[PDB]
Design a protein around this ligand. Sequence first.
Ligand SMILES: *[C@@H]1O[C@H](CO)[C@@H](O[C@H]2O[C@H](CO)[C@@H](O[C@@H]3O[C@H](CO[C@@H]4O[C@H](CO)[C@@H](O)[C@H](O)[C@@H]4O)[C@@H](O)[C@H](O)[C@@H]3O)[C@H](O)[C@H]2NC(C)=O)[C@H](O)[C@H]1NC(C)=O
Ligand SMILES: *[C@@H]1O[C@H](CO)[C@@H](O[C@H]2O[C@H](CO)[C@@H](O[C@@H]3O[C@H](CO[C@@H]4O[C@H](CO)[C@@H](O)[C@H](O)[C@@H]4O)[C@@H](O)[C@H](O)[C@@H]3O)[C@H](O)[C@H]2NC(C)=O)[C@H](O)[C@H]1NC(C)=O
Lengths: 231, 231
Amino acid sequence: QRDLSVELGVASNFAILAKAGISSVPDSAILGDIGVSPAAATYITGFGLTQDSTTYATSPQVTGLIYAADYSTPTPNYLAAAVANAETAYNQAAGFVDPDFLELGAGELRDQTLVPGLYKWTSSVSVPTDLTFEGNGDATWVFQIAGGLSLADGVAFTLAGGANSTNIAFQVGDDVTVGKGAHFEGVLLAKRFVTLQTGSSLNGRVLSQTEVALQKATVNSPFVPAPEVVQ
Amino acid sequence: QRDLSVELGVASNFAILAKAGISSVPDSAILGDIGVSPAAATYITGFGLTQDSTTYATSPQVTGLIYAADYSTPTPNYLAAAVANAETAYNQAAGFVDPDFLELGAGELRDQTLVPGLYKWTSSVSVPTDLTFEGNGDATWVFQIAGGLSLADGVAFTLAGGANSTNIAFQVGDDVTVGKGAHFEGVLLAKRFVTLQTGSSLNGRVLSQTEVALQKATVNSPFVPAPEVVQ
Ligand SMILES: *[C@@H]1O[C@H](CO)[C@@H](O[C@H]2O[C@H](CO)[C@@H](O[C@@H]3O[C@H](CO[C@@H]4O[C@H](CO)[C@@H](O)[C@H](O)[C@@H]4O)[C@@H](O)[C@H](O)[C@@H]3O)[C@H](O)[C@H]2NC(C)=O)[C@H](O)[C@H]1NC(C)=O
Ligand SMILES: *[C@@H]1O[C@H](CO)[C@@H](O[C@H]2O[C@H](CO)[C@@H](O[C@@H]3O[C@H](CO[C@@H]4O[C@H](CO)[C@@H](O)[C@H](O)[C@@H]4O)[C@@H](O)[C@H](O)[C@@H]3O)[C@H](O)[C@H]2NC(C)=O)[C@H](O)[C@H]1NC(C)=O
């Protein structure tokens, strides 16, 4: 019943967006664009970046484009808006009041099934086992985590009942780590570091205010609609 | 006392933004960028556009850059966001309830002094004489006009008491016309056509969902902060 949609603005153009840097131990696999701002291109590492034709770059690990804050106009302002929009989104997700679940499992989410609503914690959160999201194509979930977030090696987020991960948002105050072969679902609004350990995969987006590290990770963000030109 | 700020997102990057076209009878003089989307560059007329180096154009009449929806990546998505943000802003300005002034002067604003607040009309609005905005550096005004808006030749909008035109918004449902040598203050959220007649001037921005016509007009939009790069 409650609308806990989070608005992402330009950030919904990005598989990954980071303020300070993005790194990869290859081969990672990214479906969607990636960007850093205010960081310049030197802080996107492990991608073997080739430039054009000079407002973006390409990389074999990115199906899509790579944007850095020191690229040619209008990328800088394109990125600044994505970043500010990402900050706006973080703060909205954190802004929600009157949670439905408070301190659930003392921070440990074990063989859980999460119904739609607001989940808050004052601690870190560990997911030792598979976690299920159940509700309809329109149900929204928001998670407010004041500490860090981890998923144990091999755990999967799975969707049930028609749940859509464009409607799942994680606001996290401290470092996030997705263990090896683990699977993540939703939009990751991280104030600090994010690490996607080897062979981990993520259906959603990663928006970090510091740094994003991928270790042979797979990131699949939703497609962007082609803005339709009037010739 | 009331916060009637309107959020413009990427549109605050633009002196002028239009959906269907921008035209000029030269020399107009624009401080700030201009853009059309979803329209392509063929619909920016009278500007003698030179292209780069291919994601934007220049024109002697534009101190700043020109963006069209058919320019090279990432301009299309840069523009789509500016445009959608402009639509969001229009709808917010129209969305406000409980006006302070309703049907003021039966649509005619004559030797008026407008205090901060919500002004609504179900009609068109004519300004036959100079109009004064009085309030502080933080006071906000919003105008909801269901019909058109005109300023008579030679009339000026003037600011008093520390009023700031970044805090003045006009939402207008039908064509706008600023007469010859007339002077406009504020953000113009126009659902249809906008015409700035010969020698008219505007301190603010013009955001139109159809077409913008300038006739030797002067448009001065607020400066955009350089997003500050981390090399
Ligand atoms: C999870 O939830 C996501 C968030 O909504 C869904 O995203 C999609 O939802 C619908 C999937 O079909 C899409 O709605 C469709 O939109 C098209 C748009 O086409 C054009 O739209 C123009 C307006 O901009 C119009 O001129 C005209 O309608 C034109 O056709 C529309 O045609 C369809 O009728 C339908 O309304 C929606 O656009 C899309 N959203 C995004 C962000 O891409 C996911 O589908 C959903 N997935 C699952 C597994 O549940
Ligand atoms: C009309 O109202 C406009 C809307 O506010 C005003 O716009 C300006 O307002 C202030 C004019 O001085 C500006 O505030 C200043 O912001 C600078 C920012 O500098 C840097 O900011 C970083 C954060 O992003 C920080 O790292 C650090 O602060 C750094 O210095 C700040 O330094 C100043 O202390 C001050 O706060 C404001 O930025 C600016 N807004 C815009 C949109 O440009 C107009 O000034 C006002 N004009 C009139 C005539 O009343």
